Amino acid sequence: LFDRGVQMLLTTVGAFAAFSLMTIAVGTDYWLYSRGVCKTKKKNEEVMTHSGLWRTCCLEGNFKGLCKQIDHFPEDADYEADTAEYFLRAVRASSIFPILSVILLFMGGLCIAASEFYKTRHNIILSAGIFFVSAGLSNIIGIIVYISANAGKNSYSYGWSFYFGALSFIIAEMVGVLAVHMFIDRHKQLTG
Template identity: 30%
Template structure:
């Protein structure tokens, strides 16, 4: 039973880590980083390239000037092009899916705690599958954000001309890396719970306790 206890503790810690990483990712503003190497600003006082970084809720230029992004739930889209409406829909999906993933992690952690205390194989199996589906949901949110970012940059290039964005370098920052880490931790927790369910099932069989202990 020592192995079972270790598996349950590892799954619980993985879920806590997943929540902490995703909460930090959702709250931070370094999902998308944009840098512009402007040759006209290469003199004294302009050593740093122009840059901005954005998160799910706002965009920041320089060090301190941050402005909220357009609220996709209240935006009037009747007079917007189809491509812009599609971007708004993607942004809306991201702002729903990733915070929802946070709530689901908390619910999964509670389910895992209850199934551990009850020593129930079906509950452990359910919670393990729940975390795997939660990891898939987080992955879907990240994928939608990546698609949204690429399409937003393509729309900007279309509106202002490809030559205007030739000096622009884009990348995904540490906030997106935290989200990837959360997805991995949540998936790992689900897999560990499935292994724990298997170990508990073996321990409940006649003569199965020795095989779990060793």
């Protein structure tokens, strides 16, 4: 690895980049490009359907920009007997995991700045590292519950905000390994 200084710049810019991409992915109107209807009851037309995480929109139909909250309302009696499928539905309706990836990556992406205030304490970096890792784990479960709920093909492709999400995972854990490298210096100074 290169100098111990730029590692801090690289770690903080990595945390910034992953956090920006994940929050954008959470906030973006769209995640995939598809076909269907953005709002009915339009029960006699079809519209290229442009759906994000918590919001959805549609375009290239008779109207454009009729954006709306995501279509992930409850099912036919929610099938609490199929409790594992309701669990999937509820977890993707109470969409904790992507905003939890935001929240964890937020806290880690700021906590790493206290590597240079109250410096060398080397436990503040460990808590950042753990959250850097847990943010990617929280991203991966988030991705899978999205697609599992999608599959709860119809000519659709994932889009830029989705590749940003995956790119946020890639970078957040690169920061995680870089944080551990900085840890295994600063702590071995105490252990020898």
